[PDB]
Design a protein around this ligand. Sequence first.
Ligand SMILES: Nc1ncnc2c1ncn2[C@@H]1O[C@H](COP(=O)(O)OP(=O)(O)OP(O)(O)=S)[C@@H](O)[C@H]1O
Ligand SMILES: Nc1ncnc2c1ncn2[C@@H]1O[C@H](COP(=O)(O)OP(=O)(O)OP(O)(O)=S)[C@@H](O)[C@H]1O
Ligand SMILES: Nc1ncnc2c1ncn2[C@@H]1O[C@H](COP(=O)(O)OP(=O)(O)OP(O)(O)=S)[C@@H](O)[C@H]1O
Ligand SMILES: Nc1ncnc2c1ncn2[C@@H]1O[C@H](COP(=O)(O)OP(=O)(O)OP(O)(O)=S)[C@@H](O)[C@H]1O
Ligand SMILES: [Mg+2]
Ligand SMILES: [Mg+2]
Ligand SMILES: [Mg+2]
Ligand SMILES: [Mg+2]
Lengths: 550, 550
Amino acid sequence: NEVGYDDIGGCRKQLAQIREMVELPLRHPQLFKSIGIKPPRGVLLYGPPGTGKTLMARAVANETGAFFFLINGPEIMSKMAGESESNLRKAFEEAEKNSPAIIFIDEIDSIAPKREKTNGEVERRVVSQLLTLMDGMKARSNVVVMAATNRPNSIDPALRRFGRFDREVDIGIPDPTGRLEILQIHTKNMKLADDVDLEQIAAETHGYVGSDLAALCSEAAMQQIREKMDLIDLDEDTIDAEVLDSLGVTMDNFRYALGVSNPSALREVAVVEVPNVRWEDIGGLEQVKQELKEQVQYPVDHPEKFLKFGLSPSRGVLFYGPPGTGKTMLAKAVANECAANFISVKGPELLSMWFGESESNIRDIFDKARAAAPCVVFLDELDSIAKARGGSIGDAGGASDRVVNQLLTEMDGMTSKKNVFVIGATNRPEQLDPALCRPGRLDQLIYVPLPDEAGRLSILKAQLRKTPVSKDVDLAYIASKTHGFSGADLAFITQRAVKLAIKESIAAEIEPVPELTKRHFEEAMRDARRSVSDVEIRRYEAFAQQMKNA
Amino acid sequence: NEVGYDDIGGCRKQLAQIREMVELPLRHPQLFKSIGIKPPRGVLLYGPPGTGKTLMARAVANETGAFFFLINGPEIMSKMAGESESNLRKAFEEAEKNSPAIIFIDEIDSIAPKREKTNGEVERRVVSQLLTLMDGMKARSNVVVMAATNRPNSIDPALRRFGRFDREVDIGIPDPTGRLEILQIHTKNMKLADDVDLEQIAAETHGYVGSDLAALCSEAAMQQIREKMDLIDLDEDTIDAEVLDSLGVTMDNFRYALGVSNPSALREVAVVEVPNVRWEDIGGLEQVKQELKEQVQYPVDHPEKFLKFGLSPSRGVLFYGPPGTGKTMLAKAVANECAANFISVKGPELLSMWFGESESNIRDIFDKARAAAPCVVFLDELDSIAKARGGSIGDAGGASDRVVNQLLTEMDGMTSKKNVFVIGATNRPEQLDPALCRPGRLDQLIYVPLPDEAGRLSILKAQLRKTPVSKDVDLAYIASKTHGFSGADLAFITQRAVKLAIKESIAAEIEPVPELTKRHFEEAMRDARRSVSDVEIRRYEAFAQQMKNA
Ligand SMILES: Nc1ncnc2c1ncn2[C@@H]1O[C@H](COP(=O)(O)OP(=O)(O)OP(O)(O)=S)[C@@H](O)[C@H]1O
Ligand SMILES: Nc1ncnc2c1ncn2[C@@H]1O[C@H](COP(=O)(O)OP(=O)(O)OP(O)(O)=S)[C@@H](O)[C@H]1O
Ligand SMILES: Nc1ncnc2c1ncn2[C@@H]1O[C@H](COP(=O)(O)OP(=O)(O)OP(O)(O)=S)[C@@H](O)[C@H]1O
Ligand SMILES: Nc1ncnc2c1ncn2[C@@H]1O[C@H](COP(=O)(O)OP(=O)(O)OP(O)(O)=S)[C@@H](O)[C@H]1O
Ligand SMILES: [Mg+2]
Ligand SMILES: [Mg+2]
Ligand SMILES: [Mg+2]
Ligand SMILES: [Mg+2]
């Protein structure tokens, strides 16, 4: 119940920050005294809910030799009027007494909402009590104030101003590497069986917080007990120890526990996440591959030539082309190359968060990408922004609405020195306003054509990298016959053909064929159907000839 | 008044959960101690109102040897300021005193609304009192907190976060099997007559909660007394016992009680319910029957071939075709085959719940289907979503509105590993945006043609399975003459012909004839009228030739 550094894992970069911010001024205040700067007393934690934010507090606090004081958000708000503000005054006097001191406040937004958006003056006093007492502190006190929340936007920003809270520290969703470590934290207390592959689990878990993983560990434990319920009689007052020794959680319990309701995660926000697709997994289009190698990889790798040449680059890249051409995966593979952070934002994600009005988060998309620089910001489904008013034809309203007017501010509100990059992608590029296509905003426009038969060969090579295909498969004879078919169409054929294979596989199981026959294919090849009209392409090829007329 | 397990019935799977969650840590805390996990102290009950949620609390609580404490929602809110929060502190100290303890809180939303949507700070204190005192508990306390509500969305979600309430337990509407059991619970105390067939009643009751059934039992009792009111004089101070012995409730009292006012149920929500129609009840269209056997039955039966083949399936199926082609029943019969759970959602059900703004429920549609996985989510009347803005022509607004932008998020917010399935059905498929028809969202598109005369034969065989038809009935001669007539038209003819039969049946009464004559038919056959123009079909057949051009 007392937390060390080993009890938390995965968010190493974040803990590297806090040790510089909290561990460093306390065990060595002389360093800031020798260099002659002020120690930051404004450490702020934030992130998604249930992400160890309370856990990382004591992970730092118990690893000091400093005094610690604890404040809960609702504990002060539970108290009566006046007495609640007394405890804050009782808090800081003890911390300024025991001068090496740590003040952590969990759920800071409950005692500090926006003063504009609040009703009770008792809430307004305790905010005003907090704003007063933060400034009443001293640098000679050597007392560090920590605060955590899950809603960094609901806070009164006067705290987030200078002198009170300056150190915005986000706790992001961990990678499969770091969440593997988190599983090892919870399972090292657990009693498992030898079949348990956490690395298989951590690969199969993608958007989970540690609370989801701890519930995941707690869930598969229960199913292990459910298997033993036949051997366990509940009318007994104590079960025997032999079933306790056999109580070892199987890998299949986690396979059970991956398909249950725990696995509903918290992924419905504006997330930053490193991608997984690469250049080999996208067949063909090597010209625009190198164009991204030109336009976005050269700044993130070498800003030195720019200051050599005195020229800031174009930060605005627009993808366009026919639909179903893998334009979503393109920005993921290039962020996976130069290891930049990645933020996927779709069209209705703007709108559905604006039926709930999350537009500071839209600014925070740029801010977190500024916080996670180098980062690329990917705007999927830009036609949906036009389809917020139906289209450019639409309900007579064009692409421009409150979304565009927000984005044009935030795209122009980006420093050109920043390597934070914005990637736009649509399939209906005529149906977007040129105000967003304005130079400085989005001036690079990249057409994504259909592949040729060599590209369609390279896709079918790349798509079937994980499939047990047959040996007689002439993909080139497929690539000969597939001409007008998109890369989405080719994957759609394989989804048909695998379904045709399962119409042989479990059909034989009810009557292992791990091979995808020509008979599986020539049925789907006869059933093959083109999804893109060539007269639609003649539009895009005229745009590929010239869209700069606009 | 003291409730055992036998006093509740029907929701066996839910009680199987709670015994794992409440009975299991209390009579054997050693199991979680031996396996080394934390016992969940966050049991939350929810469901429709009047569904035994208060009843199942004591059904668990009286079946422990544990201490129990009771909290009512409005009882705390009835109290004065400060004193109300005192009783919560007085609650948990007694439970942490008597350490095997059960804390049930009925109507948790009354003491815990959303802190964003509330006015009194006294409400905000008692929420803050609750959030504090939940975290003040210990695992060594071995104290379980139960809470029930009928509005799971009105709660402050900080309770529903980790450490406070993790175990979301829904109490669904029971099947006719389980509600049969509920009738036997109430009637075993009652004095009935021998004509009483609860199984006939439980078949005839479809969307009732146990409160509706208990009112149903109480209603037919009163009509039984109404029959005895001639033998009962109210000026008497005590009626004789002979009418008490004859006071036995008839089956016809329930036949009276089924048509009364009670039978208004609570069915106006997003419900999950297993269907009843099967493949035999839908004549013809065996091709798209097998297509559903391919596309949706293979994943729900065998995910093993997918991980064999490394390919996630297409989770998005769109039904389309001309109107009145039985497309509503298609998703019901396939959920009845592979025993998956079923959620019927119509078009205006989205809209009418969004004039009252129930969109978390729209997310909870996917969440409850995730809770009731395997489940299929059926979206009836997708043209109505377009008709929210009139159509795609409409009021110049297309299909896209706040509904689509919500659904595109929630459809994309589904894990591909989940067997939770989404089934779309419209009759105006041109009038829907391709953004919803996007691959990953809804890529399987299934045309539903009119049947042939053999299909029209199979329908008239299937529709007349429960009708006392005549013996001279040449359905093929009907099927010869019925050519352009839909399956809805054929049922419409029978509704005419039965009305023509009742224009012979009770006409002969006014002057058993349980046969549907050719004379009943050839009148309706002469009165037969086609509902679908063939030029409308030539649209759909061109879509059936090619809609992939979009
Ligand atoms: N990354 C993680 N590593 C280990 N345990 C974790 C992690 N994330 C969450 N947990 C566990 O889940 C709990 C989440 O509790 P809290 O940190 O209080 O939640 P939070 O992160 O503070 O956000 P709140 O409390 O909902 S505002 C932790 O106390 C741990 O028990
Ligand atoms: N050339 C291609 N190579 C590999 N995969 C492709 C290719 N074209 C399409 N796909 C796949 O088909 C889907 C289309 O990806 P997206 O880029 O999202 O489609 P889009 O071109 O953006 O247009 P929409 O409206 O989103 S379908 C993805 O699952 C891709 O993996
Ligand atoms: N499934 C059921 N089985 C047996 N009796 C039931 C069932 N559902 C409701 N009842 C009866 O109806 C009463 C309604 O009380 P509860 O349903 O427990 O209250 P609730 O479920 O919390 O819903 P509220 O009070 O309207 S929010 C119960 O006390 C039972 O007598
Ligand atoms: N092939 C069929 N087999 C059996 N019943 C059918 C058939 N076609 C239509 N019906 C009946 O016709 C009615 C129409 O059902 P629905 O699915 O609602 O019709 P639809 O095709 O979905 O178009 P609408 O707009 O709902 S009328 C139902 O009562 C069906 O039982
Ligand atoms: Mg917290
Ligand atoms: Mg796309
Ligand atoms: Mg109740
Ligand atoms: Mg219908």
